[PDB]
Design a protein around this ligand. Structure first.
Ligand SMILES: O=c1ccn([C@H]2C[C@H](O)[C@@H](COP(=O)(O)O)O2)c(=O)[nH]1
Ligand SMILES: O=c1ccn([C@H]2C[C@H](O)[C@@H](COP(=O)(O)O)O2)c(=O)[nH]1
Ligand SMILES: Cc1cccc2c1C(=O)N(c1ccnc(Cl)c1)C2=O
Ligand SMILES: Cc1cccc2c1C(=O)N(c1ccnc(Cl)c1)C2=O
Lengths: 289, 289
């Protein structure tokens, strides 16, 4: 099954992973491949929230780094490092005061501008990379225009890694770099992910980059190829061992098939209703830690 | 054998590679692994010039981007794009006029400064990344100091990819990014190489990054682990088919073992005599195209 590469990697970190200081069990250099013409790679062995994947992709793809967009969509994925940026502030005076942040940010323009904005997160690196001259570059923009024009280039690349920012910045991007490849009709993407939580993050990571490859294949009139997911250090926390173990006890079902609106073509102007997941039938979600 | 991953990948592009416009046969997403504790990965099925590997590594590791250093070492690897930068010039008035470039550059300080210097090549990206403020960053410096200090970080990364330069620059780096990993005693490196000529470039690429992993393992008091070599688009030119084919007809021998001076410890101040290759016994070199 399509999601078998995920289960193999969790199995392998479990058996031959290495310990390091709660600490981890990790492995360096693993790859997973997913033929996206055989379905969509949302895990069935565990329920994965696709509208959270969906919204946090479109957020990046607008070049947006403000939390408001994500909260206007009932997605609370990125809120922590925003909340984090209002408490270490000049202004500041959990579970409920975090509901505070969200109506204030949600409704107050001069508040959403200070504390909504995470700054150096993916929407900027993808769509507004800051240059020496203080201009800004849309690399993903440039790249897609390149796919259409020069589908065979070996330069179809998007980096989220800024050697100037990464010493200073809050969270150095785990989704370090990606590359496109075209070949007789079909668009493949490969991702270099420098660091991966196999239990919590990886199941989302795959869905975002599979969705990203479909969306981009859509805009350029192409059918979809492989999504290849390459790791530096893929690791298990030592307090997610039974959860993943239990998840290993389950038996994948047919993969869902994704559906994209057949005459909207620029993914930068996409909203929810434009992407549909068909026949997703998962085993239940697992709480942790 | 240790060099078997190389031969498998050349075999695989030959059998299931894809054609694209002389044009290529290529494959997207392949990985090669090399346990560097079982020897050094210089190819025996073809002779690979290790002192050229050796000098063009130390050149990068000085932060140097001038051709002179490489010519004072009888290495002529990077000269073309230098020569290229003197003919499209304001000054300009092959096989012999390229011997011209080399004594002039070799002996004339005000000439070696205009035309020696390739500018945006690896020595700068590794040791002097240019910042928004016009300062400069030694990322490899920073990284090595990190390995010693925080051997378990998942942030041990060096990028050669500058979204600001890559649209303008002469040659967007093929050796896009690399990452280190430590684990009970041993240093591993993984390389993301976005584009690879399997016949001409790849056999060097492996030796440079294996050598780089040994040198860095040396400075940080560590024993060596895996070198994992990850490809975007690894390709064969359609006019190197018989050469590689013929190379497939040969039978690897024990791998050489490398030797590094046992009380010099900073690789940034290294020169030749500090690295020795022991018991390298290759089949002959193959001309091409
Ligand atoms: O989208 C994400 C974001 C983060 N991580 C994980 C990888 C690392 O465990 C951790 C980041 O911490 P560092 O490795 O960067 O220190 O979060 C993911 O798997 N997916
Ligand atoms: O050290 C090197 C430098 C270059 N190449 C190859 C990869 C590509 O074939 C070509 C660069 O051309 P583009 O793919 O960047 O267009 O050179 C290598 O294998 N090793
Ligand atoms: C595990 C996982 C899974 C899916 C999606 C996400 C994460 C995660 O930690 N983050 C995240 C990254 C950086 N900061 C925060 Cl507050 C969250 C995600 O956006
Ligand atoms: C194939 C191979 C093999 C080993 C080493 C090198 C190359 C190559 O094309 N270059 C190179 C890169 C960019 N410009 C030039 Cl003139 C040369 C190398 O440095």
């Amino acid at each position: 099954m399509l999601e078998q590469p995920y289960l193999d990697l969790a199995k392998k970190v479990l058996d031959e992973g290495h310990f390091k200081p709660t600490g981890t069990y990790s492995i360096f250099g693993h790859q997973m491949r997913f033929d996206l013409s055989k379905g969509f790679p949302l895990l069935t062995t565990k329920k994965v929230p696709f509208g959270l994947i969906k919204s946090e992709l479109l957020w990046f793809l607008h070049g947006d780094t403000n939390i408001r967009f994500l909260l206007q969509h009932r997605n609370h994925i990125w809120d922590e490092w925003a909340f984090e940026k209002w408490v270490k502030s000049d202004e500041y005076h959990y579970h409920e005061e975090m509901a505070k942040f969200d109506d204030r940010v949600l409704h107050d323009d001069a508040f959403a501008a200070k504390y909504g904005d995470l700054g150096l997160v993916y929407g900027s690196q993808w769509r507004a990379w800051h240059t020496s001259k203080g201009d800004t570059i849309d690399q993903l923009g440039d790249v897609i225009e390149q796919i259409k024009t020069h589908p065979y280039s070996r330069r179809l690349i998007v980096s989220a890694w800024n050697p100037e920012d990464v010493p200073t910045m809050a969270l150095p991007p785990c989704h370090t770099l990606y590359q496109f490849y075209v070949n007789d009709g079909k668009l493949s993407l490969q991702l270099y992910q420098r660091s991966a939580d196999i239990f919590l993050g990886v199941p989302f990571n795959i869905a975002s980059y599979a969705l990203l490859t479909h969306l981009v294949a859509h805009e350029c009139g192409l059918e979809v190829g492989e999504f290849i997911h390459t790791f530096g250090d893929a690791h298990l926390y030592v307090n997610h061992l039974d959860q993943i173990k239990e998840q290993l006890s389950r038996t994948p079902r047919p993969a869902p098939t994704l559906q994209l609106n057949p005459d909207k073509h620029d993914i930068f102007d996409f909203d929810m209703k434009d992407i549909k997941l068909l026949n997703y039938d998962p085993y239940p979600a697992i709480k942790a830690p």
